[PDB]
Write a protein that binds this ligand. Structure first.
Ligand SMILES: [Ca+2]
Ligand SMILES: [Ca+2]
Ligand SMILES: [Ca+2]
Ligand SMILES: [Ca+2]
Ligand SMILES: [Ca+2]
Ligand SMILES: [Ca+2]
Ligand SMILES: [Cl-]
Ligand SMILES: [Cl-]
Ligand SMILES: [Cl-]
Ligand SMILES: [Cl-]
Ligand SMILES: [Cl-]
Ligand SMILES: [Cl-]
Lengths: 120, 28, 120, 28, 28, 120, 120, 120, 28, 28, 120, 28
């Protein structure tokens, strides 16, 4: 099969203030060569995750996601580039993109909608 | 215009220049 | 395009005691003429929201939804007649209907299912 | 039979008489 | 502008004036 | 249940020059009162079917559909307002609308796409 | 109609540590003959529910589900074999199967995916 | 995995007088033991295919399907119990059922709708 | 009532008696 | 190999021997 | 929006010996710069279309598709890279890939299944 | 092994070397 990036779900509707995990899958034959894996997560014009050389590089991470966004490293060996974002706000609504380079390269879009908060 | 550090962001990946990055568009 | 009312989602499965936002969208060209907008929300034979002349009229609101149902006014300018209902119970399961009059008129149905509570 | 205030409910909208309202059916 | 025979087309139905007909729009 | 018009299928992809049947369903309790049934089919700004008083009125039928479009009367007693169009061309692509008045009134949209012809 | 078991939803994505209700429906004409109803719930090679003779038999219930899994008896008269599992963990991910014997017999599969927990 | 019968498509809309192939798949590990395979196709209360002991038994085939229905034997080794029916008529509309016994047993339903013919 | 040859039809398979066959229902 | 109490588990139902039970497979 | 290639339909089931049009869409702002457009169609390890510099290059086209496959040039200005294949056979079943380079680059997969022929 | 004319096929596009082409795989 050709190198393809796939998303099990391309539309998330999350409640205000909750935590969400948007998932993105890439092919991992045999074992995982972590050195060759590059994972970029970004929504709109802001970077969220720049995973290069086995670590997350914070150089270009948008300040909104400081201590709020996380890429589970241990799931990468299963071909899962799952992105976690906690305490989502209305500014987190938009189109996310998941760009993965591991031998080949591909990307998919994911749409997230955030509901308005419920009053007291 | 164009954000900073797009050179480090794009020099190692085809994500930019293929139109995949909105942070660093192909001609920013 | 013809005047149409649309629902992004026509089947909600909500947990007992949670809060839900069922959404309903109508076309808003240019700015919003609030005086001409009429929004009715009702499930089964009970009215939930009677939004006329820019305000909610409680004259026919079913008593179950007193201080429990809300129509976010600020989203109406975006063409969003989103209905919020808090602390949903098993009596909230059924078919909701969203009737909107703004120049033209249309309506759509939404089905809500409420799970039984989980014991201690 | 028929709920009260259906006149105020229906006189300004086509929702009733088009079969859209279960609260105020077309012939209650 | 407006097609002919919209009067016969619309006088018996709510399809026009509810924004449902593109042939006879509500204000043609 | 409220008076609703429904479409089993809202997107048809038909081959050039073929025949298609786009279907539209309305509720028929007991027997059918044909005198009270009004069925309008129109795509874009052109009328296709004006079924009033038990017969099709050709007064406003677009000339493209002369001897090309048909509403099967015998299926109306089953609540089926099925529209047949033969020898479809590229001009037949667009959004159709199905407007039915039988006691109440409702309508739904259907999108038809017509493929380009295959060469010799 | 033939005796069939159906699932309104065959793919659940639940958050770590939450409670879920996976549903499974079977036909109940007239009243319910509880004596003739047998309901088995099992995921992977472990039994979860063995509902025979109107009661749950714990003889073969996997120890993970002790005081954690429940079959709502009162919904059985509605043809609902809904399974509740509380405080779901990563070990709860897999394929569940719902086997129902009531006159006839049938079964359906349900897939549950459990997200990783969100850190502090 | 448990023994399951699956259908790639559970709703067919076919034109009057055309030929259709409704498909039904069962698991074939290693090679195929044809002697152990039993395939029944039936719609409504009429049998269509009774494939036992490597051949079709016509003893109970409904006369409507004489020289009209066929089960492609060569695809059985691929786990494909595909049913072909030629020159479909309005009497062919209904719910088909595909019952397969090969070690285990399972079945699935398929709905076929036949359009009315287009006039000259 | 019941069609003929249901005995040959059902004696080798669980399809009948599990409610799967409309031709030979469990209690015809 | 095979779990215990599969006899009580399977003797009253067709779930096993039809390939539906992974706990008690048809030939464990 | 980012440069993306999309498919309105990713699974085609075609009858043996018929003609099919599998569609693939790319973004065309303003007018179309034909010189910059590159379109590759290939299924399995065989090339079908190599559209470079405004013309189809037959240098690497698989011989099976000689005078059988066609890319409608006139639809390219609408952002439609629609592929036509006539007289499809069982060898045409598999996964097609649509690779488009126009400023950016992207690709999508399409699965085609071909039914067995119906006998006399 | 590797088909002919993959050089002309791949030198102008990123389709190969990104794993998109089965005709000309990245390392044929
Ligand atoms: Ca720089
Ligand atoms: Ca009154
Ligand atoms: Ca006039
Ligand atoms: Ca007999
Ligand atoms: Ca035992
Ligand atoms: Ca070469
Ligand atoms: Cl810069
Ligand atoms: Cl009154
Ligand atoms: Cl006029
Ligand atoms: Cl008999
Ligand atoms: Cl044992
Ligand atoms: Cl070479």
């Amino acid at each position: 099969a050709a190198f393809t990036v796939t998303v099990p779900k391309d539309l998330y509707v999350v409640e205000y203030g909750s935590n969400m995990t948007i998932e993105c899958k890439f092919p991992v034959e045999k074992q995982l060569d972590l050195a060759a894996l590059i994972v970029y997560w970004e929504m709109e014009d802001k970077n969220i995750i720049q995973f290069v050389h086995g670590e997350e590089d914070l150089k270009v991470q948008h300040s909104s996601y400081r201590q709020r966004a996380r890429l589970l490293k241990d799931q990468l060996s299963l071909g899962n580039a799952a992105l976690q974002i906690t305490d989502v706000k209305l500014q987190d609504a938009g189109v996310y993109r998941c760009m993965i380079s591991y031998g080949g390269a591909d990307y998919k879009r994911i749409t997230v909608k955030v509901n308005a908060p419920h009053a007291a | 215009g164009c954000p900073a550090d797009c050179y480090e962001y794009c020099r190692g990946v085809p994500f930019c220049e293929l139109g995949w990055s909105l942070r660093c568009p192909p001609h920013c």
